[PDB]
Design a protein around this ligand. Structure first.
Ligand SMILES: [Zn+2]
Ligand SMILES: [Zn+2]
Ligand SMILES: [Zn+2]
Lengths: 84, 559, 263, 141, 159, 114, 65, 102, 196, 133, 43
DNA sequence: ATCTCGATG
RNA sequence: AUCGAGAU
């Protein structure tokens, strides 16, 4: 189907699962010399870069949350709130 | 079942385990040979190369090196043979299977795996010797003990998979469990027998010990706190320095039976901002309890704070105790001469109780309790009589054991043992039972061939009068034998009957999961629960509070 | 003299029961530790085996010879094998012995340490003699032979220390007790009725005062006076054991102090 | 000479066995309070008396020092593990070539013994050593 | 039995009461009697509860009994868990065993029921009926070695 | 097998210096000295004589783990005094006591018979 | 299997006292406890070493070649 | 929005009970600033406590009973393991039937 | 370990000095924890230890023969006649520091067993290696550099946590992983890699 | 920089509650018949017994690392023998017309009860306690 | 070796139970754990 | 009812 | 591959 930018209910907060793999999939790209959109106050490890790429919401991914019928809702990692 | 849903797999290990207290909770002592063998594929990058090449150089036999290197073409460079193995200029966009190192994420499990908790991500710390070492206070979830228990360890291969381990699976995340909405990790054995005796009012610690203890705590702020006592000789209380291990913004209030903001039993617990004010610290406070110091510190300060907490509590109490010491003799099961006299006769009065009911019953006077045989109401009367006899002999003993009796000292900590354990050691052991009832007549109308037939007395039907101290008699022994055969049997029959339960329970629920609409449904989209747990709330984030709208006077609701 | 103070009482070829007065417990301990584990000694750290027809296995026998007590009086003018510039041994850092015995008789032929045979040029220094305190003259029972069995060996003693392996203990057993009556209250005695009919009274209560019951706790009291007894094995006579310990202890304090000098 | 009889389970049904012969049939006529509490003589009938009771026990358990002052399933545990105890399994180990065989260096007869250790040749062919043991919290390792 | 109940004045207090405990079951006829309270009367036969008072009462015994199993040992387990279990058992309309009869004939894709007690048969009558497996189930995405609709794999990742 | 050779207890490896000194960041006028290939025999005797001196605020040691032959001494001292000395003075204080003793024993040894 | 040179726990030589010990029991007709004390074994760890060490060697020698 | 009102219900009954006027001011003497903190705090603290979509409760609820199930071992009732066995079998053939009438 | 079903693994080895010592100079060969004594009621263990002390001392055989008029008392009385306290305690000194231990300690010869099951016979570790012919899974058993089974049950645990990708990785890139071709119509392993 | 409370008490009971190094004391004040005290005390360091007369002060000084001595040459409010330092934790209206404070000296607790102690026993961390002669 | 000569095996109401009449003939303690507990006995 | 070992056609 | 013996 689709769904609009509106009419979204789907927790605006981030699941730990969401975060997990966003971190994970970023950590990956970093670990394969793909560019870093932060400044490294002095870190090497791919994950702990991704962690800092995230907390200054400079990560350019979009979650696609499926609903059980067959629809879904899109969510940039700018919108989602990292509490936890 | 065997090859698709449960394979055998690469990059795994297994060893004996043993407990190590100078090792943080979320850590795993990996022995060195294993880390010399297992490997994670790292990808060359500006960030790493310098370290990274030094590995390749080192070679696959001095610890922090590596085996194989893999290139554009995917060709495998074998660092252990190969002419070119002291060479190799690392070219960005390659990989380098490397020795597992300090601070890597790994899945450390014990079988049987009947939890999430039986599988957790740990933090590697490579060490000599050949034992997966671990922290005492990660015992319960795994269900381990160090009498030869063996444990598997799995190693992630993907950057994402590493994340999955450190972010979802990690030991400090699992502390506060959803299962029983309480913490699953506590403070056990030496640590705990000590978290307490350190604590007594009576326990005083003078300057020289204090200073090592303070230091012993890693987080220590480097500020000798002012001693309670300054007068004659400036002393510190047990409590006092243990307070250091406790972080700040930590508040805890207990109250047990005789407790009063004066606590003349040094009862309960009062703690205001990482400071212990009165009360002995024992299992109720610092076990895997619900009101628990650990339930608090976790939710309040964070998972990683409570994780280091454990270490610090340990390190100080483990030290102090090491210099104070503790033991256990057979003297700790002996008890006062006149008490053994009182205990004996306390049994004796119950042996006439039963005698009398036997003699009563023999004259058809015994009346039947509505809906059971005279014989079942004879048996019932008797069994009770000697259960109440054991207990009372026991309680009689629970009293001689003085506040220094090492058995009792562990008992008061909640570290090991129970009343029953005292009862049977010092007092009488008690009645033996098979299939619920006292000892059968396997022979004709008699228990053994040392008895006359038709003998329903205690002795004859499996009452062990002596203690594990004095020692059992031939008969007692043999009945006692029958006792814990039945025991051993259904033990290893409980373990199968159950291993099947946990398989079907699992296989039916399995695919259920809260979807992104906070409903709760299976593979077909068929709804089960419209909100998870009926409030859409994770169990871990939940605790026993009181609803003081419910109870008390209409007056004092209004007062 | 000045601080730390001795009063020998009993004295033997292997026993030195003394009172050690005016010291920190700290050092009474650190002396005892060193005395066990840190004064150097000669013992056999390389057996080179020609023929062994014995009941016992090679590396078993090897073990035992290692544990054989050897003279170590002039040890401190022998070098560690690691420190000498030679390839493997020399006579400058090792002392080699040989064992030959062969079942000859019918009636069980014994092999004592007494049959160990110096070979290497001693340089005329007191070193690497199988120590014998046996009365009938034969040290340790190495192993037993039958009618037709051989032992043909080559021992190579090296300098070493307990820390490395306990064959280099010169030490055996150190007695050590302070404050006979619990005047300082460094223990809390475990009791059934009377704390004092139940624990006994060490000979060491004789050379100290009772407490005149009424008196309160001596609160700012510390420990002087430590009743010791160093039992030597034989490698070194007893005097030297306490001595070289005091020495070696001093010597590794030195190295730190002098290691700030270097830094 | 008829001083002894071979009794089976079935015939055991029709008899009365005495446990001790001593304290169980002299004339009836103080009690060191730490001794255990054996029952009485309440029987006059006895046809044949038990040789000695520690013969209800089998090979393994007869190795245990004081199994009477011991919870019953413990004894059972030990009686599986004495069969995993390292020691001299035979004098002639030196001449027998079997897949795997362990022997202890300095085998040591125990200090605490059972009267049925004599017939079980356990002091002659020990397994295990006589260690000075200390019950204490020390390093907490 | 012992009961905690309101006093007129507000306090909860001990009104001790008189209950009868049976050995045998015919709910059908004992609640219809005089002098009992038909609003309370309880059987440990949650199976007899259901056929009488409908599914939604049945559930709430099934639970209550599962609870008394765990609780009588001291152990506490947070509701939701046992609730879910009970909820799953009781939603097809009937009571549905946690054995191959209840939960393994239940419509599911085939590969799932495969990974359990009657393997081959289920593959056969899947074959003949021409079942279409969804590939939404845990067990099935494990067989084919793919990312499971689970925590990490429930969502999708994009740009 | 994973056992390390014993000598690693009292023999220094490569680029491993008996003392490594760093400045404790938490306190002031304070110091943490690592002692490679040494154990309680040394650390405990150093601490005690570090505490008798009356211009010392604090001192303590700890063998971070009993597999390894290391140990960490932490000293804090008076406004003025630099711990290196407080350590120096200490070490010597000790050496004398021992020299005193070594003599004093040797004296009372010689007077006895047998 | 031959006396164990030096007692495990304590460290004092004892391998040199075996033949001597057997001679004190069998010959001057003494109880092991006195014999043990006579041979300078006063602690009990050092004592238990002689009072136990069982001399299996006397049985393997028994075999021929 | 009616499920919402009904998932929150019990929490508020608490919230209001531990937030009554008398109590806020008299029992635990709060101040505007601290009170408005306590207010903002709970909200966050609640929100965090929600279930995260992805949670595989299916398994989790099984394990959480299946575990303490393996930890049971030893006034006439079928109880422990054998009862559990009964229960989950949906026993028609059951051993301790009992009516309990008030 | 011991003789009354009280087993144990070694956790650590200390050198004689670091061991706590008795004033007579003795040190313990082996230290057990007092926390495995209340809950298995292994009283004999204790009694053996007391008996065995006396007997080592007096140089007499320990009679622990089962049914007997031997008594904890009957022994203790003798242990005293010899100079040590009658319940096997001795005052000990933490050898680290020298200082007396605050508690007194149960100390005695106790017959211990060495058991089979040593570590360096168990310490298998695999990091990829040989695979079976049929399945192309890693082989059973350390005896041929085999794998470790990531069983059905350990799967359940990775599902619980929510770790999907790790599940894949464990169940694919380690162990079996294999690419096949498939018809985009008659959906079957019927195809034909004339790959090249 | 000053004192907070002062009085001479007399002890009635001396209670060792399964303890050999502390006794908790119930003592009463000469002077004002609306006042009494409760005090957990190290009775090995500074003994105490039947119908005794003890003096008491609170104070708030003579907070960084505790230096010691160098103070055989210094200020010390130590004209007193026994002396502790605690945190204070509750101020109990006995109701009235009367008020009780609660101090903790590392688990050695303290109760007090009067009514001028108002503008005089603050609400505070500071609380030394000095007990002479 | 002695024990394993003096062993008993039983294939397959309630036979694992130590039974009264075992007194004297079969050992009440000696038996393996789980698997085949109480089916296997020693004399 | 996760592991090690031996044996066997 | 069949098979028994063990660690939990
Ligand atoms: Zn040389
Ligand atoms: Zn010895
Ligand atoms: Zn096709």
């Amino acid at each position: 189907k689709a769904i609009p930018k509106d009419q979204r209910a789907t927790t605006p907060y981030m699941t730990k699962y969401e975060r997990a793999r966003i971190l994970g999939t970023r950590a990956l790209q970093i670990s394969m010399n793909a560019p870093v959109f932060v400044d490294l106050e002095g870190e090497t490890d791919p994950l702990r870069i991704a962690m800092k790429e995230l907390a200054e919401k400079k990560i350019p991914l979009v979650i696609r949350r499926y609903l059980p019928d067959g629809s879904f809702e899109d969510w940039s990692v700018e919108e989602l709130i990292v509490d936890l | 079942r065997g090859n698709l849903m449960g394979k055998r797999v690469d990059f795994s290990a297994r060893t004996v385990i043993s407990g190590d207290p100078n090792l943080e909770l979320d850590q795993v002592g990996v022995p060195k040979s294993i880390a010399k063998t297992l490997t994670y594929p790292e990808v060359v990058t500006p960030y790493n190369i310098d370290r990274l090449t030094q590995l390749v150089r080192n070679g696959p036999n001095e610890h922090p090196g590596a085996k194989y290197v893999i290139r554009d073409s995917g060709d495998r460079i074998d660092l252990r043979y190969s002419k070119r193995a002291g060479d190799i200029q690392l070219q960005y966009g390659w990989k380098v299977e490397r020795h597992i190192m300090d601070n890597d994420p790994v899945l450390f499990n014990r079988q049987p795996s009947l939890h999430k908790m039986s599988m957790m991500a740990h933090r590697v710390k490579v060490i000599p010797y050949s034992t997966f070492r671990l922290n005492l206070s990660v015992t319960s979830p795994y269900n381990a003990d160090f009498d030869g228990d063996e444990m598997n360890l799995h190693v992630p291969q993907s950057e994402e998979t590493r994340a999955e381990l450190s972010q979802l699976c990690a030991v400090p995340l699992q502390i506060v469990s959803p299962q029983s909405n309480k913490p699953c990790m506590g403070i056990v054995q030496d640590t705990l027998c000590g978290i307490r005796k350190l604590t007594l009012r009576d326990t005083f610690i003078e300057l020289d010990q204090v200073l090592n203890m303070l230091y012993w705590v890693p987080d220590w702020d480097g500020v000798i706190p002012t001693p309670a006592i300054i007068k004659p000789k400036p002393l510190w209380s047990g409590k006092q320095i243990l307070s250091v291990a406790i972080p700040n913004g930590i508040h805890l209030q207990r109250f047990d039976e005789g407790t009063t903001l004066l606590s003349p039993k040094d009862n309960g617990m009062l703690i205001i901002d990482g400071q212990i004010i009165f009360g002995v610290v024992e299992k109720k406070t610092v076990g895997s309890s619900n009101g628990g110091l650990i339930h608090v510190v976790t939710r309040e300060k964070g998972p990683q704070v409570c994780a280091k907490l454990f270490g610090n509590i340990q390190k100080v109490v483990n030290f102090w105790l090491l210099h104070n010491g503790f033991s256990t003799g057979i003297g700790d099961t002996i008890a006062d001469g006149p008490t053994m006299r009182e205990i004996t006769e306390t049994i004796a009065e119950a042996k006439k109780k039963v005698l009398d009911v036997t003699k009563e019953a023999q004259a058809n006077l015994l009346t039947a309790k509505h809906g059971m045989t005279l014989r079942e109401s004879f048996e019932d009367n008797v069994v009770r009589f000697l259960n109440e006899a054991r207990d009372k002999a026991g309680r009689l003993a629970e009293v001689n054991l003085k506040d220094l009796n090492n058995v009792k000292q562990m008992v008061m900590a909640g570290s090991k043992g129970s009343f029953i354990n005292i009862a049977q050691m010092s007092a009488c052991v008690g009645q033996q039972s098979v299939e619920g009832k006292r000892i059968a007549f396997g022979f004709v109308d008699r228990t053994l061939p040392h008895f006359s037939k038709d003998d329903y007395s205690p002795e004859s039907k499996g009452f062990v009068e002596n203690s594990y101290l004095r020692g059992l008699t031939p008969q007692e022994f043999f009945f006692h034998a029958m006792g814990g055969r039945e025991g051993l049997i259904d033990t290893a029959v409980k373990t199968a009957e159950t291993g099947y339960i946990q398989r079907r329970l699992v296989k039916a629920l399995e695919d259920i999961m809260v979807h992104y609409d906070n409903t709760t449904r299976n593979s077909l989209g068929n709804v089960i629960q419209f909100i998870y747990g009926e409030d859409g709330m994770d169990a871990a984030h939940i605790e026993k509070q009181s609803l003081d709208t419910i109870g008390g006077s209409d007056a004092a609701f209004e007062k | 003299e000045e601080g730390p103070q001795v009063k020998i009482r009993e004295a033997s070829k292997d026993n030195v029961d003394f009172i050690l007065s005016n010291v920190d417990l700290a050092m009474a301990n650190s002396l005892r530790r060193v005395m066990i584990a840190e004064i150097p000694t000669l013992a056999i750290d390389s057996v080179e085996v020609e023929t062994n027809t014995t009941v016992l296995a090679d590396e078993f026998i090897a073990h035992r010879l290692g544990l054989i007590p050897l003279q170590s009086m002039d040890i401190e003018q022998l070098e560690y094998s690691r420190d000498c510039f030679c390839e493997d041994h020399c006579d400058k850092c090792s002392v080699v012995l040989t064992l030959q015995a062969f079942g000859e008789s019918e009636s069980t032929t014994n092999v004592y340490s007494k049959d160990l045979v110096i070979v290497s040029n001693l340089m005329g220094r007191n070193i690497g003699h199988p120590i014998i305190q046996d009365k009938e003259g034969n040290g340790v029972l190495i192993c037993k032979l039958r009618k037709g069995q051989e032992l043909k060996l080559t021992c190579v003693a090296k300098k070493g220390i307990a820390k490395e392996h306990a064959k280099w203990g010169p030490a055996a057993a150190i007695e050590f007790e302070y404050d006979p009556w619990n005047k300082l209250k460094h223990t809390d005695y475990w009791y059934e009725q009377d704390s004092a009919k139940e624990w006994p009274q060490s000979k060491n209560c004789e050379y100290e005062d009772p407490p005149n019951e009424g008196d309160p706790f001596d609160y700012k009291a510390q420990a002087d006076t430590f009743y010791m007894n160093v039992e030597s094995v034989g490698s070194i006579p007893v005097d030297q054991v306490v001595v070289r310990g005091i020495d070696t202890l001093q010597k590794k304090v030195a190295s730190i102090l002098l290691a700030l000098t270097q830094m | 000479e008829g001083l002894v009889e071979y009794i089976d389970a079935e015939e055991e049904e029709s008899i009365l066995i005495a446990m001790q012969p001593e304290d169980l049939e002299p004339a009836e006529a103080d009690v060191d309070p730490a001794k255990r509490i054996r029952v009485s003589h309440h029987a006059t009938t006895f046809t044949h008396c038990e040789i000695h009771p520690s013969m209800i026990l089998g090979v393994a358990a007869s190795i245990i020092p004081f199994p009477d002052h011991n919870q019953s399933p413990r004894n059972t545990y030990q009686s599986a593990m004495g069969k995993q105890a390292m020691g001299v399994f035979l004098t002639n180990y030196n001449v027998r070539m079997d897949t795997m065989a362990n022997i202890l260096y300095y085998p040591q007869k125990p200090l605490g013994t059972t009267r049925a250790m004599e017939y079980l040749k356990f002091r002659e062919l020990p397994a295990g050593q006589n260690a000075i043991v200390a019950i204490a919290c020390y390093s907490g390792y | 039995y012992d009961r905690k109940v309101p006093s007129p004045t507000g306090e909860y207090v001990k009104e001790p009461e008189w209950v009868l405990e049976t050995d045998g079951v015919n709910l059908s006829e004992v609640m219809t009697v005089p002098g009992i309270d038909p609003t309370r009367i309880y059987t440990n036969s949650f199976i007899d509860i259901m056929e009488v008072l409908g599914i939604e009462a049945g559930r709430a015994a099934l639970y209550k009994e599962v609870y008394n199993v765990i609780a009588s040992d001291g152990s506490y387990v947070n509701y939701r868990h046992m609730a879910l279990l009970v909820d799953v058992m009781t939603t097809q309309g009937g009571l549905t065993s946690v054995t191959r009869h209840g939960f393994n004939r239940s419509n599911t894709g085939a590969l799932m029921r495969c990974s359990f007690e009657e393997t081959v048969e289920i593959l056969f009558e899947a074959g003949a009926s021409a079942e279409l497996d969804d590939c939404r189930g845990v067990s099935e995405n494990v067989i084919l070695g793919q990312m499971a609709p689970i925590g990490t794999g429930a969502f999708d990742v994009m740009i | 097998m994973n056992a390390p050779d014993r000598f690693e207890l009292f023999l220094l490896g490569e680029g491993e210096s008996k003392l490594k000194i760093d400045p404790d960041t938490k306190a002031p006028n304070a110091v943490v000295i690592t002692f490679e290939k040494e154990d309680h025999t040394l650390g405990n005797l150093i601490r005690a004589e570090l505490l008798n001196d009356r211009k010392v605020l604090f001192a303590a040691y700890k063998v971070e783990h009993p597999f390894f032959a290391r140990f960490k001494l932490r000293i804090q001292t008076t406004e003025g005094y630099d711990p290196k000395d407080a350590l120096k003075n200490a070490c010597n204080s000790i050496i004398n006591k021992l020299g005193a003793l070594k003599t004093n024993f040797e004296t009372e040894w010689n007077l006895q018979t047998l | 299997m031959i006396v164990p040179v030096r007692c495990f726990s304590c460290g004092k030589v004892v391998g040199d006292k075996w033949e001597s010990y057997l001679n004190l029991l069998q010959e001057d007709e003494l109880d092991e406890g006195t014999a043990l004390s006579r041979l300078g074994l006063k602690r009990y760890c050092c004592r238990r070493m002689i009072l136990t060490h069982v001399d299996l060697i006397e049985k393997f020698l028994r075999y021929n070649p | 929005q009616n499920a919402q009102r009904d998932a929150v219900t019990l929490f508020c009954c608490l919230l209001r009970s531990r937030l009554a006027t008398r109590r806020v001011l008299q029992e635990y003497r709060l101040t505007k600033q601290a009170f408005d903190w306590v207010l903002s705090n709970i909200e966050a603290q609640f929100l965090r406590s929600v279930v995260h979509p992805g949670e595989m409760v299916g398994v989790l609820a099984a394990q959480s009973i299946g575990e303490p199930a393996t930890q049971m071992t030893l006034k006439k009732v079928t109880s422990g393991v054998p009862r559990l066995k009964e229960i989950l079998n949906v026993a028609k053939n059951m051993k301790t039937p009992s009516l309990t009438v008030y | 370990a011991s003789r009354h079903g009280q087993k144990g693994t070694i956790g650590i080895t200390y050198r004689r000095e670091d061991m706590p010592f008795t004033a007579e100079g003795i040190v313990p060969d082996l230290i057990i924890n007092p926390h495995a004594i209340p809950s298995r009621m292994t009283v004999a263990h204790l009694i053996e230890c007391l008996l065995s002390k006396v007997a080592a001392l007096s140089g007499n055989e320990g009679d622990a023969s089962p049914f007997t008029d031997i008594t904890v008392e009957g022994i203790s009385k003798l242990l005293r006649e010899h100079g040590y306290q009658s319940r096997g305690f001795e005052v000990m000194y933490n050898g680290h520091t020298g200082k007396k231990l605050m508690a007194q300690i149960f100390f005695g010869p106790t017959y211990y067993q060495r058991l089979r099951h040593m570590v360096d016979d168990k310490i298998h570790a695999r990091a990829r290696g040989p695979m079976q012919v049929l399945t192309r899974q890693p082989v059973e058993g350390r005896s041929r550099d085999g794998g470790l089974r990531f069983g059905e049950m350990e799967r359940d645990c990775m599902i619980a946590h929510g770790a999907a990708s790790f599940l894949k990785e464990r169940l694919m890139e380690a162990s079996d992983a294999f690419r096949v071709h498939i018809c985009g119509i008659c959906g079957l392993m019927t195809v034909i890699a004339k790959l090249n | 920089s000053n004192t907070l409370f002062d009085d001479i008490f007399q002890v009635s009971e001396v209670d060792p509650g399964r303890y050999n190094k502390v006794c908790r004391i119930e003592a009463a004040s000469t002077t004002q018949d609306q006042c009494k005290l409760t005090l957990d005390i190290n009775v090995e360091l500074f003994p105490v017994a039947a119908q005794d007369s003890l003096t008491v002060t609170i104070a708030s000084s003579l907070t960084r690392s505790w230096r010691p001595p160098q103070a055989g040459d210094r200020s010390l409010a130590d004209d007193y023998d026994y002396v502790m330092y605690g945190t204070a934790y509750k101020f109990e209206e006995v109701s009235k017309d009367l008020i009780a404070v609660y101090y903790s000296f590392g688990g050695l607790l303290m109760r007090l009860e009067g009514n001028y102690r108002n503008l005089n026993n603050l609400k505070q961390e500071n609380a030394y306690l000095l007990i002479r002669r | 070796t002695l024990s394993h000569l003096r062993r008993t095996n039983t294939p397959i109401a309630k036979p694992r139970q130590l039974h009264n009449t075992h007194w004297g003939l079969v050992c009440p303690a000696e038996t393996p754990e789980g698997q085949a507990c109480g089916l296997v006995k020693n004399l």
